Amino acid sequence: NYGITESVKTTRSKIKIKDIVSDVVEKKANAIKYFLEGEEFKQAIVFGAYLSGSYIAYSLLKDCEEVIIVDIQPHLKDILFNDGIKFMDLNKLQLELRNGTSINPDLVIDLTGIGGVSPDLISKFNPKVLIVEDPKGNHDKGISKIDNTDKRLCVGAKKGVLKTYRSSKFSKTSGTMTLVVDIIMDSCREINELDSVLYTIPNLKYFEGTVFHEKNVKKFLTELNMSAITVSSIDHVEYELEEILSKNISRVDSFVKEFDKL
Amino acid sequence: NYGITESVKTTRSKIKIKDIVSDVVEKKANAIKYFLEGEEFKQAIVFGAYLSGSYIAYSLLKDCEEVIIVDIQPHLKDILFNDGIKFMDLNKLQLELRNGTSINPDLVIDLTGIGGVSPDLISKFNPKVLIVEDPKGNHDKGISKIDNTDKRLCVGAKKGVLKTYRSSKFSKTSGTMTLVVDIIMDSCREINELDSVLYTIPNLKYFEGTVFHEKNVKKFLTELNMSAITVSSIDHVEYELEEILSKNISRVDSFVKEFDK
Amino acid sequence: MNYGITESVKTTRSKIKIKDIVSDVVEKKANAIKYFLEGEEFKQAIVFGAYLSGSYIAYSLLKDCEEVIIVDIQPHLKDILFNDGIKFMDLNKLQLELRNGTSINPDLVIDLTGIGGVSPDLISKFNPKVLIVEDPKGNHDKGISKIDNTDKRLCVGAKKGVLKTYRSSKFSKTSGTMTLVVDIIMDSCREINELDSVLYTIPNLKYFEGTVFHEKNVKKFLTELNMSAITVSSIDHVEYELEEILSKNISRVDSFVKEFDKLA
Amino acid sequence: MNYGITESVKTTRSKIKIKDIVSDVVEKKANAIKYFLEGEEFKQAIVFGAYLSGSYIAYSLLKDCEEVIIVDIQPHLKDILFNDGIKFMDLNKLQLELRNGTSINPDLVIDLTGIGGVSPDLISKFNPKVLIVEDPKGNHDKGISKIDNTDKRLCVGAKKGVLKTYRSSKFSKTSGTMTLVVDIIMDSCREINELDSVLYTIPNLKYFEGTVFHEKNVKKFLTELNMSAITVSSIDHVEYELEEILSKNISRVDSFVKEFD
Ligand SMILES: Nc1ncnc2c1ncn2[C@@H]1O[C@H](CSCC[C@H](N)C(=O)O)[C@@H](O)[C@H]1O
Ligand SMILES: Nc1ncnc2c1ncn2[C@@H]1O[C@H](CSCC[C@H](N)C(=O)O)[C@@H](O)[C@H]1O
Ligand SMILES: Nc1ncnc2c1ncn2[C@@H]1O[C@H](CSCC[C@H](N)C(=O)O)[C@@H](O)[C@H]1O
Ligand SMILES: Nc1ncnc2c1ncn2[C@@H]1O[C@H](CSCC[C@H](N)C(=O)O)[C@@H](O)[C@H]1O
Ligand SMILES: Cc1c(O)cc(O)nc1CC(=O)O
Numbered sequence A: 001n002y003g004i005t006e007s008v009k010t011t012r013s014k015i016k017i018k019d020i021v022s023d024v025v026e027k028k029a030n031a032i033k034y035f036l037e038g039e040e041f042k043q044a045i046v047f048g049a050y051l052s053g054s055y056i057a058y059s060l061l062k063d064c065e066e067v068i069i070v071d072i073q074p075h076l077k078d079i080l081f082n083d084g085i086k087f088m089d090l091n092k093l094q095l096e097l098r099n100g101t102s103i104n105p106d107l108v109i110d111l112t113g114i115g116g117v118s119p120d121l122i123s124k125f126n127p128k129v130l131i132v133e134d135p136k137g138n139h140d141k142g143i144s145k146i147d148n149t150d151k152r153l154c155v156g157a158k159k160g161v162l163k164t165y166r167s168s169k170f171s172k173t174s175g176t177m178t179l180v181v182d183i184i185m186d187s188c189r190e191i192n193e194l195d196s197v198l199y200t201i202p203n204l205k206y207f208e209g210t211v212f213h214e215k216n217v218k219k220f221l222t223e224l225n226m227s228a229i230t231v232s233s234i235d236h237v238e239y240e241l242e243e244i245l246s247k248n249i250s251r252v253d254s255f256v257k258e259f260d261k262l
Numbered sequence B: 001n002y003g004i005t006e007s008v009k010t011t012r013s014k015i016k017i018k019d020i021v022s023d024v025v026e027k028k029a030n031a032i033k034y035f036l037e038g039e040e041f042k043q044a045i046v047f048g049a050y051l052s053g054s055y056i057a058y059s060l061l062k063d064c065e066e067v068i069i070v071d072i073q074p075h076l077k078d079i080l081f082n083d084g085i086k087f088m089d090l091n092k093l094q095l096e097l098r099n100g101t102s103i104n105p106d107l108v109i110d111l112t113g114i115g116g117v118s119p120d121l122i123s124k125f126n127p128k129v130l131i132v133e134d135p136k137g138n139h140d141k142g143i144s145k146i147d148n149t150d151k152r153l154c155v156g157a158k159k160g161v162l163k164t165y166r167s168s169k170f171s172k173t174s175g176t177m178t179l180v181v182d183i184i185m186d187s188c189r190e191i192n193e194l195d196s197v198l199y200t201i202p203n204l205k206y207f208e209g210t211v212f213h214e215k216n217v218k219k220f221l222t223e224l225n226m227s228a229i230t231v232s233s234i235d236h237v238e239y240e241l242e243e244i245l246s247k248n249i250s251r252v253d254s255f256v257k258e259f260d261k
Numbered sequence C: 001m002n003y004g005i006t007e008s009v010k011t012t013r014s015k016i017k018i019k020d021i022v023s024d025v026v027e028k029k030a031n032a033i034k035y036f037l038e039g040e041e042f043k044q045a046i047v048f049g050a051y052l053s054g055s056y057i058a059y060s061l062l063k064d065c066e067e068v069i070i071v072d073i074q075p076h077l078k079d080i081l082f083n084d085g086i087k088f089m090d091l092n093k094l095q096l097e098l099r100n101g102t103s104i105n106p107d108l109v110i111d112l113t114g115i116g117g118v119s120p121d122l123i124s125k126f127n128p129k130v131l132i133v134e135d136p137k138g139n140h141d142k143g144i145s146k147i148d149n150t151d152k153r154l155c156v157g158a159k160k161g162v163l164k165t166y167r168s169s170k171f172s173k174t175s176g177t178m179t180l181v182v183d184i185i186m187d188s189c190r191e192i193n194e195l196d197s198v199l200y201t202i203p204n205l206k207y208f209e210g211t212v213f214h215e216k217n218v219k220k221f222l223t224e225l226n227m228s229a230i231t232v233s234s235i236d237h238v239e240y241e242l243e244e245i246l247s248k249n250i251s252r253v254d255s256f257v258k259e260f261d262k263l264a
Numbered sequence D: 001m002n003y004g005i006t007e008s009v010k011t012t013r014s015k016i017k018i019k020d021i022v023s024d025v026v027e028k029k030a031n032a033i034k035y036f037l038e039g040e041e042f043k044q045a046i047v048f049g050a051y052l053s054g055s056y057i058a059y060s061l062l063k064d065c066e067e068v069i070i071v072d073i074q075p076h077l078k079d080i081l082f083n084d085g086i087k088f089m090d091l092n093k094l095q096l097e098l099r100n101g102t103s104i105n106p107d108l109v110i111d112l113t114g115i116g117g118v119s120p121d122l123i124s125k126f127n128p129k130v131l132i133v134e135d136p137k138g139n140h141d142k143g144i145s146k147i148d149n150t151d152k153r154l155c156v157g158a159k160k161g162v163l164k165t166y167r168s169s170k171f172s173k174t175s176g177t178m179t180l181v182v183d184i185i186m187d188s189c190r191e192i193n194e195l196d197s198v199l200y201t202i203p204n205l206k207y208f209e210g211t212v213f214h215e216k217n218v219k220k221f222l223t224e225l226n227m228s229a230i231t232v233s234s235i236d237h238v239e240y241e242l243e244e245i246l247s248k249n250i251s252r253v254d255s256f257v258k259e260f261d
């Protein structure tokens, strides 16, 4: 707990990266839960296992008789933590749609965001409820150009767009990873201004690469166990360290906006 | 070079953490070089091997017949990269001073900063030149309270204080590590505002722990070989990434202020 | 460009004036509406909300709209119109002309009033070809989101659009012209202050809104806008970077009308 | 508070006025000098630089100094003295009295003129017990460092001190009262804007310095300082947080005299 000498303290935050991830994904799951108003479903299909998809699918098990996660990456089966959730890779779903009858969801949720599922694939369903996650955060022309959320809202008797922002703060996307990074970065900025702090370390890395380039979910989850922030200071900063992090986590606001249509 | 899909790019900065470290330590070494005005010395003693001390000691070999690094941590002998530099731990030095004649430096440089060498030990020398690195950066009451740089300027015919700041930007200390962290953090914030960037990763960790808690200099040097920043974006940002990092490195200004009398 | 307290320090006032930033923002909003309207011609356009972009937006409609009427709840805002080609009606005069007469039947309705503005009830009294409602929400804020009712105002019109205005890469709480101008200037000041040799950086800001709505003096308000956005104290020349930073922040404003789909 | 454009939006003017922030800052500088002087009494104090902290600092010296004189190169700055117990001299009148008369022989000299101010040559004409020079440098800026000559002004006096003023954890380019007031208000505005329900946040700023030095109108300047520092447009009440944020940023100002050995 000392640094280079006993004159300096090293403090690692109690809040871990996985704790921030958990808070964000829980907010998204609760936003969906609120939108669905306790409606029960026979078959839910959720596109996009990483990063919030896993927990969102878990949260649907109560009111959905069957919950299926679909991901173009077969190795993301490893990111599911409950066995009640069925996993299908995109080729398996598309095959089952073409030469089968078992796929006819009354709830469809697209969490894939930028460069994700095609409106054509969504158009193959006729659910009671369709939710599309809007990957756009605050304004960025380049991201707006590549977004096609509105084109994906092409089926369903009830339609919603899942939005996630940080109150009073700028983030480029609504993605769980983006929000976690931005929470940590903003927290570091304020922590560094605490009296006696020498420097403030965000324990960040390109976690996305661990999942999608190394294709190592186990390692990714281990990486999330790290303290979010490590601080070097002369005086104790334990309590303010957690207070600043928790405050920035609390700014995340997730909600489904109903999209009107007949 | 793609991310989750081919619609998103992943870009790793060409500038590595060690490159930023190198730039900062070079500025400190050059600040000392300028202050010394080409004066030649028989024996230089540098306190504090980590983080700039190693290169600073190297830079003194030209004009100093003997250059000795002293560190309270014996394992920091591993952070010296030239064989021309002699290493002594604090115990070995303090003993050679009491019952020896081999230690009589005409150049003394204290790079230890916060919680470092005592003024009592500095007072045991009588060099031509004394340089003390001021660990204080911009204003912080807690850091000012523990600093005793001025009390260490107690010997030497010529006295100087090595200061390092970032032009127009706030940093809590002049330490190489602090400056590298702050360069990367400020660069990340500006990079994130580039059009089409989704998020911006500073490839940071508690490197100091690797050196002083794990006592693994080799691992530490390996950790520095990492790209400073990794970006997720829709469009190419390769050149802007380097421009922003380079600009923030260039804000570092290191200089020795002469302490009169 | 002059000296400060002594000739060792320079005082630089920006060439860009507050009114120039206002102009650029209101022009972007007007052009967003223009693009949405796709050259359609209209017999009668009614624009709710004269301040701050309404005056110019209404003027920009004159080309394709035979008659353009600005409606504002504040009668003194008649003073904020550019010329006589736009008709001004206070809210009371409109609501009376709606009840007694046939002269009010717009085929284009634009609501620019934003927070606490026109009621969905009043909008529902029209049956235009096109309805545009300005969304006052900027980036995320719970308190502003809670008081906004933009979606409830989109209750008439064969074609419906929502006018949105944000700053690329930067946070603003609303899309209001005033908010955006303030934030442009504030973000510019923070970057200008970091220029080498700057001592301090003054945003030439005040509560301009009060001049319009509390003092009720539009002429004074327009005079207040005819002032350099920023004044800088520095050792060295900063005139060029000063304008470049302001111009860059102005260019981040992005205004567009998002079509609100309604098949029925 | 009052309503804004409609009764759905509120307008809040801060209770803290610009003049209150000025007062707090100049008081901190005066107390820094007070602490440095350790209750020593003086026969004649000369303070160079009436604007902006000089007026109050001179007032604060009346207690322990039999005579207090403010010297300014601008004769109209006699108007910024609020106490008649303080004597005013323009620079010409002083230099003439130094060359011919004998009435000028201060035992306390304080130079508050900072950038482009009094010359070391003029300071060298005195032989006080105590010399204090205000260091105008704030945090690091190369252009400002290059024009500063504070150290060259510390050329007389049995006891020498440098008056420094910084903001804890925050960046300011100078120690000037005006710079600090501006930066306090600007940093407060940034944080206030992030309060829930705030639409926009107005710093009630203008180029006050011009009112004093270009319009040469101290009366108007003092009236200009009698405005709320910040005006906020918001949906919900923010009055409590508005004052707390301003007060917090004021409290970051730290002024102290460093003894020059
Ligand atoms: N066409 C497609 N069909 C199914 N899954 C897809 C897809 N394209 C991408 N995906 C998956 O969807 C995810 C995209 S990343 C989604 C991140 C999410 N918005 C969050 O906040 O966490 C990845 O798991 C990716 O493998
Ligand atoms: N009393 C002492 N004698 C010698 N070395 C000491 C010491 N106290 C601390 N040290 C060493 O001095 C260094 C302190 S860290 C110095 C950081 C430096 N300012 C920079 O910018 O890189 C460490 O290597 C530590 O082990
Ligand atoms: N019910 C109503 N009818 C007509 N005008 C109204 C109104 N309520 C408010 N207004 C007017 O609408 C304007 C609100 S301020 C609108 C700001 C605008 N969004 C911009 O970006 O500039 C004011 O001129 C106000 O007087
Ligand atoms: N050579 C000189 N002799 C006397 N006064 C001078 C001078 N040069 C400048 N001045 C005066 O000194 C002041 C410089 S401004 C000083 C600001 C001060 N540091 C603060 O914190 O408020 C002005 O009043 C100016 O008129
Ligand atoms: C939001 C998002 C996305 O929809 C697609 C992608 O490749 N990356 C991100 C960023 C993130 O995951 O945070």
Ligand SMILES: Cc1c(O)cc(O)nc1CC(=O)O
Binding pocket: C004, C005, C006, C009, C199, C200, D113, D114, D115, D116, D136, D174, D175, D176, D177, D178, D179, D180
């Ligand atoms: C500090 C200072 C100064 O010494 C000289 C000058 O012209 N301007 C300033 C800035 C200020 O007054 O804040």
Ligand SMILES: O=C(O)C/C=N/C(=O)/C=C/O
Binding pocket: C112, C113, C114, C115, C116, C136, C174, C175, C176, C177, C178, C179, C180, D004, D005, D006, D009, D199
């Ligand atoms: O005008 C602004 O920028 C802020 C908003 N003020 C309001 O009262 C209503 C806006 O729609």
Ligand SMILES: [Li+]
Binding pocket: B039, B040, B041, B042, B106, B128
């Ligand atoms: Li020598």
Ligand SMILES: [Li+]
Binding pocket: A139, A140, A141, A142, B193, B194, B195, B196, C168, C169
């Ligand atoms: Li952008």
